[PDB]
Design a binder for this molecule. Structure first.
Ligand code: 8NA
Ligand code: 8NA
Lengths: 213, 213
């Protein structure tokens, strides 16, 4: 559970993303209305989302872009440091280990784990592939906060259970399975199909709307 | 644009997933309330969303699970077949080639393309990695609907332009660039940081609110 609702929380990185860019194109000032146009969120809902955390900008003036960007940076906790690990050193785990932008936002990859002894010692950027049998000692020893799961679904639950009982604080999960974790552990499920299926929806919408409406 | 708003569109695959799980568990009916409890969305948004597409469920019994699942499938265009290709056969493009559930949802991978000659001829499932030099030709012969971009940023735009010239209808883009496409081409940008940053948000929330309250 959360102080702010998950619906709000999920818009926040989107605001952050859009502001960053505005910042990159030296746009200085943004209105809720401008944000609303781009974001597909009502201007009143944007004010409401932001009002949870305070009063950047004011009275008919929009927001200072740099200030709102930076406040969002703090609100998302990106001024902190998170020790991460990846489980699964196959294509997906290596692809994720290669999301190097995350290091700048405070996610420090500490280790990658696999079951395949052929992969032990493999160096992926800065880190070694180690035997997942050591992962629980490793978690406690390196104060790991987030376990990223990039393995086949088959034994994912037992893997989540080991990360949990070793003190993991959160699991970033790529698998198509709803894992059970205790209520105090953050579990975030990536479902890429939720993005792809909007592509099929859109390719089809004109045609659907002969049929339906 | 889109007839329905994108905020509704993007909730639809999530409904589809949960109904799917219900359906495999042989749960026959589910009320808006039991459904929202399960998903942590409002029971009234659920109804508002579906209302864009018709009178499902009713007064006192909730939604029939198969019926709603089936309607969501057809709404998201998943009663049809889409021919895809992937550009980039490095770790990311090969991970996405191994998202094999998409095939059952109707996305048929026809080809994978790269610039690296050391990869030409590699077999991934039933397809071969080909020189992306041939991609424009391949797209016309094979009626490709969707291009999936899994290449480095620096020359995404050039590559996107090629897929657009060859008649591609939609690009599912994994790069954090904002690609320019014509207005009739579906562009969908995956941003994994939009998910990861909700993890740092939730980990840091308690401290965030101490500093604020
Ligand atoms: N919709 C979908 O089809 C969908 C959804 C999510 C993920 N995926 C895919 O993404 C995941 C990984 O794919 P990939 O391409 O990287 O596969 P890959 O390239 O075969 O890598 C899998 C790796 O995981 C290692 N491994 C297997 N079991 C364990 C374990 N119990 N503990 C630690 N390591 C293990 C294995 O040694 C191999 O290195 C799988 O879930 C796969 O199905 C697909
Ligand atoms: N936040 C982030 O850090 C972030 C966001 C998105 C993607 N990514 C990462 O994901 C993308 C791909 O990752 P990866 O692990 O697969 O890298 P990789 O394993 O080096 O694979 C990239 C592949 O693309 C091939 N390639 C390069 N240019 C072309 C081209 N024009 N056409 C066809 N093939 C080409 C290249 O030969 C290589 O096989 C990159 O954008 C990388 O930056 C990171």
């Amino acid at each position: 559970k959360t102080i702010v609702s998950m619906a709000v929380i999920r818009r926040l990185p989107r605001y952050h993303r859009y502001l960053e860019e505005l910042l990159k194109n030296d746009v200085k000032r943004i209105s809720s209305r401008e944000l609303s146009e781009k974001m597909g969120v009502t201007a009143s809902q944007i004010r409401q989302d932001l009002n949870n955390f305070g009063g950047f900008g004011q009275q008919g003036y929009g927001y200072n872009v740099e200030e709102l960007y930076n406040n969002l940076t703090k609100i998302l906790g990106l001024d902190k440091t998170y020790n991460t690990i990846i489980i699964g050193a196959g294509n997906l785990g290596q692809a994720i280990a290669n999301y190097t932008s995350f290091e700048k936002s405070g996610f420090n990859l500490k280790g990658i784990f696999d079951i395949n002894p052929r992969l032990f010692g493999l160096k992926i950027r800065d880190v070694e592939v180690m035997d997942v049998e050591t992962v629980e000692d490793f978690i406690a020893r390196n104060k790991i906060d987030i376990g990223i799961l990039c393995i086949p679904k088959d034994n994912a639950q037992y893997t989540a259970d080991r990360l949990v009982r070793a003190g993991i604080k959160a699991i970033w999960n790529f698998l198509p399975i709803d894992l059970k974790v205790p209520d105090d552990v953050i579990l975030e499920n990536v479902h890429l199909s939720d993005s792809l299926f909007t592509v099929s929806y859109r390719l089809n919408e004109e045609e659907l709307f002969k049929k339906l409406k």
